[PDB]
Swiss-Prot record, chain B:
Entry GO MF terms: hydrolase activity
Broad class of enzyme this protein falls into: hydrolase
E.C. numbers: 3.2.2.-
Function (record text): TIR-like domain-containing component of the Thoeris antiviral defense system, composed of ThsA and ThsB and ThsB'. In the presence of NAD(+) produces a signaling molecule that activates cognate ThsA (AC J8G6Z1) to hydrolyze NAD(+). The signaling molecule is a cyclic ADP-D-ribose isomer and may be 3' cyclic ADP-D-ribose (3'cADPR); it is not 2'cADPR.
Name of the protein described by the UniProt record: Probable 3' cyclic ADP-D-ribose synthase ThsB'
Organism lineage: Bacteria, Bacillati, Bacillota, Bacilli, Bacillales
Keywords: Hydrolase, NAD
The organism of origin for this protein: Bacillus cereus (strain MSX-D12)
Catalytically driven reaction(s): NAD(+) = 3'cADPR + nicotinamide + H(+)
Record keyword Lipid metabolism present: no
Subunit architecture: Homodimer.
Amino acid sequence: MTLFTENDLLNNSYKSIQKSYHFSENQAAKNILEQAYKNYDKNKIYDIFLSHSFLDARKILGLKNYIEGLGYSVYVDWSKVSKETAGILRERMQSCKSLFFAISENSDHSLWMPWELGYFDGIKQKVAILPVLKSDSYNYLGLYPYVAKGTQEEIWIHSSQKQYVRFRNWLQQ
Amino acid sequence: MTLFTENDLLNNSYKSENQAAKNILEQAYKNYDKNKIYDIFLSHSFLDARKILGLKNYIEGLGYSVYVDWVSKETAGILRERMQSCKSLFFAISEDHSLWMPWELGYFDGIKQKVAILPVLKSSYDDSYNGQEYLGLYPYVAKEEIWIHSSQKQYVRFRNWLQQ
């Protein structure tokens, strides 16, 4: 098994956005993710609430595309700490079965990160950290298990490199 | 109605050296009742052991149970375990913030949905607290009865707040 690459996510972005210019490629992916925010369905039951540290909007998109092409629902968390946006996060985290917080080597933490990781642990108890390496063992980012990749690929939840289980079986526990 | 002043805590501490307050709070931690439903989980940042025990005695003096807090997977299991025994979480902070504070507020928000902030100012003459970032995310505590404030003019008794 292996972990996600910044190469993997950026190439997956070009499955839905153009490969012209960094400025345009950026502006494009932000429109898809804003659209997904406006298209959140209160009556849907999403598999993964996808939260992230600061990442390229292209890389967020390519991560959303990668997980959906694997057969899972993804709501992408899309700026300060308000009573108002705390309410939106509650309603939309309750709409999800699990939470992945993605981190890159350039950004391990975020302003909202520990509150969401704490809140979703309280309501659904299924929280996993998503490591995004630049190039199966990853050691608050050590408080929860981590996500890895496995004729078709699958998502694996790791208490360690030794202890893995299918995401489908990890939700059922 | 006023906010808790640091002198108020140091006063109620005299009833019971910070190393002396540590041993009392350590005994209070060591003597944790599994079958008891505490009223308040007291979480605290930037308050010495003396000012903590003073806050504990003041709350218990008004008649409310208090279990006082005291980075690893093992400890987060104790936090979850002890937090589940309380009805509400009071977070006490003095006039930088702890790395654990947003997590605890959020977790207790998920399991019991009753989180309040307890500012410890050096002097308070009003029932008003405008806190920023996470300290403005939940209602705050003011003080005899403990009152919970969604806003300055929006106040409700602590016993009402629990049943509500």
